[PDB]
Symmetry: D2
Subunit: 387 residues, 4 copies
């Protein structure tokens, strides 16, 4: 009772670990990995050791059993170093989410347990080239055959896609088009090393070059019915819950990038003199940093509220979509203003800012696009007044 | 311990009392009071007996001894009903702030305890015809003369100016112009019943038309030495403090005016159907309302932080400024969007929304413009990076 | 044959005329008319003799035969003085347009001509209680008694509809709701004197109070057969044609208000001083003015474009709505920005700005709200790629 | 004359040619040049022979002798295909603009003519490591050696510094710090290979990758007094005049990128289906497209006017800075939204929109950043007031 914006000593220490790891271990090689686009294997092994990686995996699976407010708290620190790296680590949590909320005891121990005693990666396969935002459209067929299922399809833009040990899979189990979204799909947990899973090439994208984003083909994949999460048909709902829980940490990724641009821009404004006055002395510039500070702040508090809402055990769809919407948006506003203050240098590859601009954009695309976030928020807002 | 976004039981009770009051007692009559420009004496008196008024006066002074966080939540409600009345009531606490934060026990029993016994009002006198944002530019002087300070000068735009029992007055006490702000000004406690004071006529502003705004000339007003707050020079430092601890409460009322606009708009949106579809079914409007909720949802969190901060004995300046800047601005975007989705009806005096737009305006002018707020945030921010 | 951003010697003349009247005879009284709300009859009587008022009526019908471009530059200057009066004098051109563009020679001389004889008013009756934007949602009836129509209905937000000799009416003729817009509506030139025409009371609005606005219940108003403009059920286009034709003027009307806002605020900026600096010194303010300039410039060039399109015979719809949208939008931004720069004064009635803020609000709703503008621009734009 | 937006047959001609060349030779390779960064010699040469490259060289000297308008008309076309190409093709005009204004006929014959007979290039050197926007801040020392001038210092970000036949240069001739900008600098022409010029490495930037951007060093270069443009003292005013004529052209190209982003997103919105309907059916995607068209049509007019003003003999400064600022601004807004409509796809390199976003950022930095562009508008604006 009574509002409180105070972290608990443990949370404070996690923050200390992540922050140091980002500043002294990530930022130097962030640009190296940006250019080469090479997978951050060294970094993820470290992140794993420092215990900043499968932070949700329950304690009884050898995990830290940390909450969501904690994940966001960390992700914002890792993001300040490099979103391309943070996304990679975050992939595991997004993929582990379905098994964490909805898996049974035997499933939790078999798949979350491995991730704890071995730095393995996993991916969350839902998006199809045919449709990403409208989840209820996916065509990946899952034909029930005996005591197993035959998956059939193709996925697109999957994080850690070609580096996962196993995947979360959402497929259409009910062959009837008329079937309602709430009982038409099924969520499975399919091991990567399965005959029939053709993994596609790495896509070259504009902003998180070191992440493993790939398309993936499932032609006649067999999946044991034991590897069916809740039941046949409760896939959609399981997927929904996963997003609801994970969107705050994604917002936290935005504020991370936002912070970095706020820091970069300021340090420079404080060093560069232009019409004899320092850059920071020109009201225009000072006002920019003011608003850049105003935005990153509000974004910090939005994800916090969202995570706290979930951990308090309240459906957070409303506050999560608000958080993602705003943070991903402003993360893109701050990034550009940074390269703007840095002038001609900001457009150049040697300065950090340019990369921050390229990275920013996906925060308005993956994890639900900004338009979908609005759509959800209006869906939640009106339902309060409706009747 | 950790983060919390939960009000206490006492806060919930207060919030309720406040809400039911604005909802049922203010909202109705506010329409008439706005048109007649008549002071809302009745609504004020009921507020005073309900205890929604001098919620800062110390418990050992007949007061409640509530914090800035408490005043805030109450104010968002009163405002929701009507900002003209809220501002009329909030002015009281602003005037009493310098005494609360810097008056000795005797000045407190006297001027504070007095407001416990009868629904008296008071005002904060600082702004002048040619000096508002630039505090250290006031010219109203107060030269010592034995055991009195004889004060000459006029003040402008003083809220509750013509309906107050006593005043907080900030005047220059150092002749030498070069004398620094942190020792040149002195805050005196003037009784309205004092001879020398010339009270101007009620100014007609477009906004919170039932609130009492007017100018006050001070010809040869003597002030018994004992009414100085800390002493000569303490003025700037004491006014500055009040401003800080009090800004979050005004931003509260901006979010209040915002929440109202949002409500009215969503209710009307679920009413008017245009191309066979209700307004809530047209995506332009849908995204509009979602965005609308967002700006409110965030502004509320900004003042809450600013309030929590100061209550915890922390320097709130930075946040008090961020809150006020963001709250005031968004209220203006929500006012006009509310008028916008009510279309033609919104422009008509029979509909509440047009009033909301006229009112929202002062929120970027008084209590520190959006402009000076940007300046403060910038100053507060850059200092973090100066070495 | 090559671009030309220059007026004809002929046009420059009108500009200077309407400029004088606005900034000489209109401006001073506009202030009082707003506080009192009474119809600016004198000013209309003055504009009429001075020319500038029924500048569309064909030469052969008594009028100057001028055209929308001229109409724009003339009204832009007028609106500078008071949109209230502008909307009053424009109510005529709106009402005349459909009688012009689609009226048989007989009705042309019959109706438009008397306007040449005396300063008479006319209204444009489209909107009604349940619908405005949804034009095809008109429920106003009109039955044919062979050689005489019988109109039953009720219009609502009619400008100049309380001082009109006659009104253009658009009524649903085919009870069958499957009736395609293009064919389901008929346009009548009805006279106020006709029985059954029961005029509503004046509406109090937030802004152009000076202008007369009201509803009209058409009890059993019968209208002689020869009053149909084109032909029973071709009325839907005439209104749209009048629109397109006339939207540049309301835009220009907006631009006039935007200019008044910019003229007013800049003057203040070069007089007011805050930290021992004229307001203009502060880079934040100068950048603000530079943007208010940019907006007026583009809206000016945007309406000058639409006005030209239709004057070159080319259909303007696309460029017109682009203009109405943009101009309207920036009008408000400029009004609220001008207020801001005047500080307390801005929010005060002894000052011009406040009025301008309350006036600019209608420019986003009436004569095609900002939304439907974006709606038709997307329509026109898309079809250029559509097949 | 009289307002006209209709083209000349010849410009309609240039337009068609630039349209064919651009969309039929540039766009199908532009990407490959973005991946390799190879200076597009095949493109430059073909542009040289199509007669859409050194358009401003007068007839007598060999060139087409075209004005600023036709320049923009051709530049805005090429930009649609690729800004990187366009920029190199444009660097030439920038490098020779001063001479055209400012050069005695002897200089013209020898320096613009040497161009008109072979596909040669030329650079415009002004930006330095420590000065870019503050042009009066350049510290390169040009000393008067009795019969010639010696050059000492270094320039930076010189568009096409490694590929220029000759360079225009702006150096500080008056050592006396007190020396006002109006008489401090002088402009020279320098054959690329005068001894002492150490051209640096090609800079790697985020967006006009193929455009040959570098920094040069002028350790001890001899330059004959007959290569001085006007004469000792006149430099700043010459560099300015060049900028003033070129800025509309920089504005035009930004619009080109915008139109390329608009056409690209409009085509995908008409082929991507999401909730059982193509993106165009969603009001959010439809309204986005309208707002993108609006910024384009306007941005187009802003330069079309600014180019006219200058071609009409009257200073275009105020209009150039407006066109440039608004153009560079909306060019960036469209690029991003262009990405947004494509969703995940847009963020991938197999698509155009992504490269468009990387190219747009520079349009708010080179040729006069967005904020200095504002400064100028405010300068000229308040000027026509305070007199
Ligand atoms: C963190 C790691 C680093 C980052 C890794 C990369 C992350 C990624 O990109 S993954 C992103 C993948 N794709 C997306 O996120 C796109 C987002 N898509 C959506 O949000 C949905 O498609 C959305 C909201 C449009 C819904 O589709 P739609 O079919 O219209 O919804 P609806 O009919 O309401 O849903 C179906 C049923 O589930 C329920 N449901 C929907 N949303 C929710 C919710 N939030 N909570 C609970 N139940 C829900 C519905 O209420 C309904 O149940 P019923 O009607 O029986 O009560
Ligand atoms: C709706 C609620 C009911 C009431 C409705 C009506 C409310 C109102 O409208 S009354 C408000 C009228 N006026 C304002 O709000 C004033 C806005 N102006 C300001 O905040 C200030 O003038 C400001 C900070 C922007 C500019 O300060 P400036 O004039 O440069 O003085 P500055 O140089 O900061 O003075 C510095 C000194 O004061 C003190 N000081 C300065 N800022 C602060 C601060 N934020 N916190 C504490 N002390 C401070 C220190 O001693 C400091 O340093 P030093 O000792 O070195 O002098
Ligand atoms: C300052 C003082 C002066 C101002 C005073 C105030 C004056 C006003 O307020 S003016 C009235 C304001 N109201 C409006 O502007 C209402 C706007 N709404 C509309 O225009 C319509 O509802 C609209 C066009 C958006 C959508 O119309 P909808 O009902 O969907 O019909 P739509 O499909 O567009 O058109 C149907 C047919 O009519 C034709 N039509 C409609 N609009 C047009 C047009 N602009 N040009 C040509 N033909 C048109 C269509 O081509 C189609 O023709 P066909 O049948 O041959 O194919
Ligand atoms: C086309 C190919 C693609 C693009 C390739 C890349 C192109 C580039 O980036 S080139 C580099 C671009 N750099 C710029 O745009 C920066 C421009 N800004 C400036 O130079 C300054 O900041 C400026 C002019 C705005 C203001 O300050 P400052 O530098 O002190 O000069 P200022 O005081 O305004 O004026 C000095 C003198 O010049 C005169 N002057 C100013 N503007 C002009 C003008 N537009 N025309 C002529 N004379 C002028 C002034 O009147 C004054 O003269 P006087 O002796 O009568 O006082
Ligand atoms: C690098 C990268 C990594 C990703 N990683 C993952 C991952 O780990 N797992 C995963 O499952 N997915 C992942 N994705 C895919 C991502 O989830 C989708 O991009 C996103 O949900 C959008 O779907 P889409 O790409 O199909 O866009 P589209 O669905 O084509 O949408 C296109 C545009 O239309 C708008 N829009 C769509 N529907 C509507 C509507 N009805 N109303 C209004 N506007 C609408 C969208 O907002 C957008 O502006 C990733 C994508 C990228 C690029
Ligand atoms: C691809 C490319 C090509 C170029 N080609 C050329 C070329 O051919 N020739 C040439 O001469 N130059 C060229 N330049 C350089 C260009 O002119 C500069 O980078 C640009 O003017 C920004 O200058 P800067 O980097 O020195 O900005 P800085 O002066 O370092 O500081 C700039 C930042 O602070 C802002 N700022 C500065 N002063 C103020 C103020 N008083 N008020 C408000 N905001 C202010 C700027 O707007 C921006 O936000 C090019 C640059 C690039 C990247
Ligand atoms: C209805 C109402 C009620 C009020 N109630 C009270 C009350 O109870 N007590 C009291 O003492 N006062 C009160 N005031 C006055 C109010 O506090 C001031 O109006 C406010 O502080 C702004 O000051 P100003 O009007 O002098 O604007 P100015 O200081 O004149 O400034 C004018 C413009 O310049 C901008 N500006 C100034 N300096 C800068 C800069 N450095 N950079 C950028 N922009 C700048 C300002 O924001 C504004 O836009 C009230 C005013 C009103 C209208
Ligand atoms: C002073 C005044 C004078 C006027 N004079 C005239 C006159 O002479 N003649 C005349 O015919 N009318 C006149 N009007 C009315 C004016 O034309 C209407 O207000 C306008 O058409 C908007 O219609 P509405 O108010 O009925 O809004 P509605 O049709 O109720 O629309 C309400 C809200 O929803 C939005 N909306 C509606 N449909 C959609 C959609 N499909 N997609 C997205 N958003 C949508 C609208 O933008 C608005 O925000 C006047 C109004 C005023 C206040």
């Amino acid at each position: 009772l009574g509002f409180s914006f105070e972290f608990t000593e443990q949370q404070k220490e996690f923050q200390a670990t992540a922050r140091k790891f980002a500043r002294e271990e990530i930022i130097p090689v962030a640009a190296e990995y940006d250019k080469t686009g090479e997978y951050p294997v060294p970094l993820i092994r470290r992140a794993w050791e420092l215990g900043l990686m499968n932070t949700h995996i329950p304690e009884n699976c050898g995990g830290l059993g940390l909450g969501t407010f904690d994940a966001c708290l960390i992700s914002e620190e890792l993001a300040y170093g490099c979103t391309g790296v943070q996304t990679a680590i975050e992939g595991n949590s997004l993929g582990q989410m379905p098994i964490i909320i909805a898996g049974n005891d035997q499933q939790k121990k078999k798949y979350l347990g491995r991730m704890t005693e071995e730095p393995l990666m996993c991916a969350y396969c839902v998006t199809e080239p045919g449709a990403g935002s409208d989840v209820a459209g996916i065509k990946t067929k899952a034909e029930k055959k005996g005591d197993e299922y035959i998956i059939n399809g193709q996925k697109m833009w999957i994080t850690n896609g070609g580096k996962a040990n196993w995947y979360f899979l959402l497929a259409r189990s009910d062959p009837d088009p008329k079937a309602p979204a709430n009982k038409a799909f099924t969520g499975f947990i399919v091991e990567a090393d399965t005959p029939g899973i053709q993994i596609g090439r790495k896509e070259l994208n504009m902003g998180q070059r070191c992440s493993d984003t790939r398309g993936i083909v499932f032609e006649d994949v067999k999946v044991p019915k034991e590897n069916v999460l809740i039941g046949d048909g409760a896939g959609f709902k399981v997927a929904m819950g996963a997003f609801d829980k994970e969107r705050p940490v994604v917002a936290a990724g935005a504020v991370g990038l936002a912070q970095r641009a706020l820091d970069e821009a300021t340090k420079y404004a404080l060093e560069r003199k232009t019409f004899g006055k320092l850059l920071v002395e020109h009201q225009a510039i000072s006002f920019m940093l003011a608003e850049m500070a105003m935005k990153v702040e509000l974004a910090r508090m939005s994800y916090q509220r969202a995570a706290w809402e979930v951990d308090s055990g309240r459906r957070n769809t409303y506050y999560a979509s608000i958080a993602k919407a705003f943070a991903g948006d402003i993360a893109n506003q701050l990034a550009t203003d940074a390269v703007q203050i840095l002038g001609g240098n900001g457009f150049n590859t040697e300065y950090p800012v340019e990369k921050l601009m390229r990275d920013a954009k996906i925060y308005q695309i993956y994890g639900g696009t900004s338009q979908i976030q609005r759509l959800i928020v209006a869906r939640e807002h009106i339902d309060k007044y409706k009747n």
